[PDB]
Amino acid sequence: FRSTRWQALLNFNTQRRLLLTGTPLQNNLAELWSLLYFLMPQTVIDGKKVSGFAETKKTVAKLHQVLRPY
Amino acid sequence: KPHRYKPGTVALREIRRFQKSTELLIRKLPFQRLVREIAQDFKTDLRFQSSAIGALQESVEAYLVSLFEDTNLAAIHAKRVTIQKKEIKLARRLRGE
Amino acid sequence: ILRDNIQGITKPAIRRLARRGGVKRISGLIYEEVRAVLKSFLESVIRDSVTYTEHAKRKTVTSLDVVYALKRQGRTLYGFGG
DNA sequence: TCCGCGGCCGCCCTGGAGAATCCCGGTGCCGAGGCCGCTCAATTGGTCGTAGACAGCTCTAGCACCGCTTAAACGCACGTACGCGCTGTCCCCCGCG
DNA sequence: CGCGGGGGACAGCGCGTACGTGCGTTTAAGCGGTGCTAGAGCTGTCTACGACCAATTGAGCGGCCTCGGCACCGGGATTCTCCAGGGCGGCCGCGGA
């Protein structure tokens, strides 16, 4: 989040975005939310409402059940 | 043939540029290293803030630029154009320093 | 940071500074002699600055401290803390 | 001695070329100044004082001149020797990778 | 940090004249005197003329946030300058009758 390119490449005059990665990290929902903002900036910064509060199997199932469309 | 400019040709547009532009011309981190190394002798382990450093470099830059202009005036007075040690010492002495 | 940083004002830096004075050629021994002149001026300013800092019961040196240090030079024109 | 001509051919003028110009816009960004609180010493009033020029003597030396007596200036004539002109030398940092 | 080199720093010697130094003879100041009077100046004075806190007060500020401007290249002949042929400053030399 604190990176310079986080703000550098988030304000381009481009109508479409494409992101390629090897494999996103399973834990540390911070970078998952960061990528969610990278694809397009609409999601709220509060990632603790969906998960991160309360178990691992349910947490990962909910994590996979919210990023399915993209 | 390569477009090798004669010495003193680029200087025209160069002085056109840097007379209008008003940015710095000295590396910052070596300068703060210098001011530290001169400060510890007077007072060790000084807790330097972000300020009190740019003012010193600006002041010394203005003083040395004035001295260099005076030295250029002395060199032109010496029926020449280049700088030398004697021009600098004469300009400094006539400045009261 | 504390060892041989007098070369911070480099030879290309001195050449660029002399460019602002209006000179075409800068001799080889110009760089170190103007380095010594800068060292002398900086030492003269900072001696007064640190003495004022000791007088003011202060451990840190502020910009206004060197402003007063240069004040008794006798010009005192515009600048921060003027 | 005329001068025909031929040569050393290389230099300002001309044409071609290299990089920048400082605005027209795009995109993105950037902290002045008025506005809910405020606060706080300013602005008159009354008292306090006080000293600092209005006279007034005062006092003391400025000054312009009258009348001698020199002192460097001034012109001139020659000396000379060193800045300057002219020219030659070398040099080492600027432009570029 | 490295190299080509070329305009520029630095010197050798002639010019000659431009001060510099040695001749007389001044123009105006220094000194002795002076007779005054004209400016510089503190004392009775007394008044007006400055300072400071009560009731109010306004006025500029303490803090945020919009938005018309900052920064400079897409966009680029001309400016700025540099470098290769042409006609030429002509220069000059040498030789039949």
UniProtKB/Swiss-Prot annotation, chain A:
Location(s) in or outside the cell: Nucleus
Signal peptide extent: none
Highest taxon of the lineage: Eukaryota
Additional detail: Present with 656 molecules/cell in log phase SD medium.
Subunit text: Component of the SWR1 chromatin-remodeling complex composed of at least ACT1, ARP4, RVB1, RVB2, ARP6, YAF9, VPS71, VPS72, SWC3, SWC4, SWC5, SWC7 and SWR1, and perhaps BDF1.
Free-text function comment from the UniProt entry: Catalytic component of the SWR1 complex which mediates the ATP-dependent exchange of histone H2A for the H2A variant HZT1 leading to transcriptional regulation of selected genes by chromatin remodeling.
Record family assignment: Belongs to the SNF2/RAD54 helicase family. SWR1 subfamily.
Name the record gives this protein: Helicase SWR1
Species assigned in the record: Saccharomyces cerevisiae (strain ATCC 204508 / S288c) (Baker's yeast)
The encoding gene: SWR1
Residues shown, of full length: 832 to 928 of 1514
From Swiss-Prot, chain B:
In-chain residues carrying the UniProt-annotated modification N6-malonyllysine: K20
Modification N6,N6-dimethyllysine occurs at: K43
Record PTM N6-succinyllysine, positions in chain: K43
Main location group: nucleus
Origin superkingdom: Eukaryota
Annotated transmembrane regions: none
N6-methyllysine: modified positions: K1, K43
Record localization: Nucleus; Chromosome
Swiss-Prot/TrEMBL GO biological process terms: aerobic respiration; chromatin organization; global genome nucleotide-excision repair; intracellular copper ion homeostasis; nucleolar large rRNA transcription by RNA polymerase I; positive regulation of transcription by RNA polymerase I; regulation of DNA-templated transcription; rRNA transcription
Modified residues (N6,N6,N6-trimethyllysine): K43
One GO molecular-function entry: cupric reductase (NADH) activity
Modified sites of kind N6-propionyllysine: K20
One GO term describing the cellular component: CENP-A containing nucleosome
Keywords annotated in UniProt: Acetylation, Chromosome, DNA-binding, Methylation, Nucleosome core, Nucleus, Phosphoprotein
Other facts noted in the record for this chain: Present with 213000 molecules/cell in log phase SD medium.
Family: Belongs to the histone H3 family.
Assembly with partners or alone: The nucleosome is a histone octamer containing two molecules each of H2A, H2B, H3 and H4 assembled in one H3-H4 heterotetramer and two H2A-H2B heterodimers. The octamer wraps approximately 147 bp of DNA. Histone H3 is a component of the UAF (upstream activation factor) complex, which consists of UAF30, RRN5, RRN9, RRN10, and histones H3 and H4.
Its biological purpose: Core component of nucleosome. Nucleosomes wrap and compact DNA into chromatin, limiting DNA accessibility to the cellular machineries which require DNA as a template. Histones thereby play a central role in transcription regulation, DNA repair, DNA replication and chromosomal stability. DNA accessibility is regulated via a complex set of post-translational modifications of histones, also called histone code, and nucleosome remodeling.
Name of protein: Histone H3
Source species: Saccharomyces cerevisiae (strain ATCC 204508 / S288c)
Organism phylogeny: Eukaryota, Fungi, Dikarya, Ascomycota, Saccharomycotina
Shown segment, full-protein numbering: 38 to 134 of 136
From Swiss-Prot, chain C:
Predominant location category: nucleus
Residue numbers carrying N6-acetyllysine: K59
Presence of keyword Lipid biosynthesis: no
Residues that bear Omega-N-methylarginine: R35
UniProt entry keywords in alphabetical sequence: Acetylation, Chromosome, DNA-binding, Methylation, Nucleosome core, Nucleus, Phosphoprotein
PTM-bearing positions, type Phosphoserine: S40, S44
GO molecular function, one term: protein heterodimerization activity
Modified residues (N6-glutaryllysine): K71
Keyword presence, Transcription regulation: no
Post-translational note: Glutarylation at Lys-71 (H4K91glu) destabilizes nucleosomes by promoting dissociation of the H2A-H2B dimers from nucleosomes.
One GO-annotated biological process of the protein: nucleosome assembly
Residues recorded with modification N6-succinyllysine: K11, K57
Localization (cell): Nucleus; Chromosome
Gene Ontology cellular-component annotations: nucleosome; nucleus; RNA polymerase I upstream activating factor complex
Summary of subunit composition and partner proteins: The nucleosome is a histone octamer containing two molecules each of H2A, H2B, H3 and H4 assembled in one H3-H4 heterotetramer and two H2A-H2B heterodimers. The octamer wraps approximately 147 bp of DNA. Histone H4 is a component of the UAF (upstream activation factor) complex which consists of UAF30, RRN5, RRN9, RRN10, and histones H3 and H4.
Family: Belongs to the histone H4 family.
Function: Core component of nucleosome. Nucleosomes wrap and compact DNA into chromatin, limiting DNA accessibility to the cellular machineries which require DNA as a template. Histones thereby play a central role in transcription regulation, DNA repair, DNA replication and chromosomal stability. DNA accessibility is regulated via a complex set of post-translational modifications of histones, also called histone code, and nucleosome remodeling.
Miscellaneous remark of the record: Present with 524000 molecules/cell in log phase SD medium.
The protein's name in its UniProt record: Histone H4
Underlying gene: HHF1
Segment of the intact protein contained: 22 to 103 of 103
